[PDB]
Design a protein around this ligand. Structure first.
Ligand SMILES: *[C@@H]1O[C@H](CO)[C@@H](O)[C@H](O)[C@H]1NC(C)=O
Ligand SMILES: *[C@@H]1O[C@H](CO)[C@@H](O)[C@H](O)[C@H]1NC(C)=O
Ligand SMILES: *[C@@H]1O[C@H](CO)[C@@H](O)[C@H](O)[C@H]1NC(C)=O
Ligand SMILES: *[C@@H]1O[C@H](CO)[C@@H](O)[C@H](O)[C@H]1NC(C)=O
Lengths: 296, 229, 50, 49
């Protein structure tokens, strides 16, 4: 088979930079009971520029290598910012049971992203304790993935009525962290952020700043269209997409027509020349010259 | 006084973003079952199930409709009889929007978007999955009075607005038809132009499920096996 | 049927090699590579026997 | 659990809402009467007289 000659890259032209100041060290962080969600779109998401604004002590991901964040463009990334105790960092994990992981913000088993958290010494620590931050402890049923609770009802235990009828076995599920600097390191406030996102489910929105190159046709090369990598010739497409099409598939269910992000044109995809090589010979003893046959 | 009319093979829309040409691909999504009774009205509150099919020859989506929870419009304290009023002035022969009593006030707002300023038949499909509010439509000209036209016509998506809130009830702002979407699997036929010319049910009729099994629109004479009981 | 067998994830992340190669590091790549390989090998064996 | 006659009914280390559904080996019970100011002393992580 014939090898590619060069490589090409095409990425939409976006200059906006994703604001992480509020996501990272800022003036306020939300509570675990009512976890805040922020939308990030139409900007650039870099990771190496995340090591100068705030200190990092927990840099782990589940499903994506933490060294390729600048290689694949993303689609509809979700960031959840909230604060929990330092002894609960392991509870935020896919499929791992825990008090917060059961009665509070949980994480779906098919999560694909990174979990980042850092210790807070006195930013969220008070001498008399931090009673602003509440964590649920009682729940009638476990939460479904990505669910929030806002009810302030008194949990019902046993047959004694609760939910406004204060009495025996009536307990308020929300307790206070009571963060204090004098406490141990395992109980200090921790600012945890969760990065959840989807890939190749829609037109690309947030991509790395690696620039595009000039388009080359008629030569099969390594191409990277909006995070789609492959090998094949680039030729003009007579068939026309609808205004709301960007991908193309065949009976074989393989990509063959991709809309160019820059010029908004359609290019057909076909793999390089491929076949099989066979050789014939009249006999080693008789002579040595041979003939070569190609198939396709 | 609601009226019931049988649906006639309407409500097919492109399920995904992909372009297929001359393919017999099948997929499962929230579609409208064929030959299903639909309420006919000629301003009641209609519950919003998993899906709705609107088609008539202004929409309000919300839960409490009393400025206590954000409500889609296309925190508002709706009036007892909210409506829109267009007045034909006497000084000049024009139709102005003199009367406006849609809501009372809007204290807190989360997302606001205003587009450009703005005999036939309009089809609308609304569905909220994974926090996305997708609208499918096609302005198809007809010249009939009663009875939805027999045949097929795809519904191209218009736009996706990411909101992701509770939607349980909706009220419209005159004959319109409302149908409810259900989880179903069809066999979407495609052509050279990449348009959905025809489709077939897979749970309605045993002949239809036979076609679904064989992945073809022609069934040869003989015996076949489809599923298990 | 042999051609249609490709699109099955076989329990791995995805049914396409290109997506797996770019998204994951080499140490974690094999966990999906072998999962794909076993299924494709089984499909080829079935086809050749038939 | 639902006697509604005990002043104090607390379970520590286990969920009190599910205890008739677990199988154990041996049960040891100690019972004594203490003053009103000594009830709080009887608790895990508690000290006093
Ligand atoms: C739909 O329901 C109405 C009454 O609810 C009934 O009169 C009508 O015949 C039904 N349509 C069908 C599909 O038979
Ligand atoms: C509207 O927003 C303000 C400011 O955040 C808030 O104080 C107020 O409670 C909100 N209104 C309602 C009905 O919650
Ligand atoms: C939406 O509201 C209804 C009642 O208005 C409630 O039963 C349901 O749980 C709510 N769902 C969500 C996702 O908030
Ligand atoms: C497919 O599209 C071409 C381009 O306009 C058109 O000429 C042809 O008639 C179409 N095929 C149909 C409508 O069957």
């Amino acid at each position: 088979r014939v090898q590619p000659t060069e490589s090409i890259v095409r990425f939409p032209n976006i200059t906006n930079l994703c604001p992480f100041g509020e996501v990272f060290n800022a003036t306020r962080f939300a509570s675990v009971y009512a976890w805040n969600r922020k939308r990030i779109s139409n900007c650039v998401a870099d990771y190496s520029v995340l090591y100068n604004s705030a200190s990092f002590s927990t840099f782990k991901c589940y499903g994506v290598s933490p060294t390729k964040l600048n290689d694949l463009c993303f689609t509809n990334v979700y960031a959840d910012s909230f604060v929990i105790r330092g002894d609960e960092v392991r509870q935020i994990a896919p499929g791992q049971t825990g008090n917060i992981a059961d009665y509070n913000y949980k994480l779906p088993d098919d999560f694909t992203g990174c979990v980042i958290a850092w210790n807070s010494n006195n930013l969220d620590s008070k001498v008399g304790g931090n009673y602003n931050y509440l964590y649920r402890l009682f729940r009638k049923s476990n939460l479904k993935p990505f669910e929030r609770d806002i009810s302030t009802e008194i949990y019902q235990a046993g047959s004694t009525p609760c939910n406004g009828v204060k009495g025996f076995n009536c307990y308020f599920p929300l307790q206070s962290y009571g963060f204090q600097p004098t406490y141990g390191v395992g109980y200090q406030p921790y600012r945890v952020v969760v990065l959840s996102f989807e890939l190749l489910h829609a037109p690309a929105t947030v991509c790395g700043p690696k620039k595009s190159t000039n388009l080359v046709k008629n030569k099969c090369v390594n191409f990277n269209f909006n995070g789609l990598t492959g090998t094949g010739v680039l030729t003009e497409s007579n068939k026309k997409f609808l205004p709301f099409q960007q991908f193309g598939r065949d009976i074989a269910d393989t990509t063959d027509a991709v809309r160019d992000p820059q010029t908004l044109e359609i290019l057909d995809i076909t793999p390089c020349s491929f076949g099989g090589v066979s050789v014939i010979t009249p006999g080693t003893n008789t002579s040595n010259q041979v003939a070569v046959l190609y198939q396709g | 006084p609601p009226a019931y009319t049988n649906s006639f093979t309407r409500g097919v829309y492109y399920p995904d973003k992909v372009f297929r040409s001359s393919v017999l691909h099948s997929t499962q999504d929230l579609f409208l079952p064929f030959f299903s009774n639909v309420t006919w009205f000629h301003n009641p509150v209609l519950p919003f199930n998993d899906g709705v099919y609107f088609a008539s020859t202004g929409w309000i989506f919300g839960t409490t409709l009393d400025s206590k929870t954000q409500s889609l419009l296309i925190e508002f304290q709706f009036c007892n009889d909210p409506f829109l009023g267009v007045y034909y002035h006497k000084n000049n022969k024009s139709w102005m929007e003199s009367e406006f009593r849609v809501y009372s006030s809007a204290n807190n707002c989360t997302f606001e978007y205003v587009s450009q300023p703005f005999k036939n038949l309009r089809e609308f499909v609304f569905k909220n999955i994974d926090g996305y509010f997708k609208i499918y439509s096609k302005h198809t000209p007809i010249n009939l009075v009663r009875g939805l036209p027999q045949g097929f016509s795809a519904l191209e998506p218009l736009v996706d607005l990411p909101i992701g809130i509770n939607i349980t009830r909706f009220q419209t702002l005159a004959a319109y038809y409302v149908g409810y979407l259900q989880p179903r699997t069809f066999l979407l036929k495609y052509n050279e132009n990449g348009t959905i010319t025809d489709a077939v049910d897979c749970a309605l009729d045993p002949l239809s499920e036979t076609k679904c099994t064989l992945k073809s629109f022609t069934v040869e004479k003989g015996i076949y096996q489809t599923s298990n009981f | 049927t042999l051609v249609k067998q490709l699109s099955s994830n076989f329990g791995a992340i995805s049914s396409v090699l290109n997506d797996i190669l770019s998204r994951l590091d080499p140490p974690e790549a094999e966990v999906q590579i072998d999962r794909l390989i076993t299924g494709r090998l089984q499909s080829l064996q079935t086809y050749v026997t038939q």
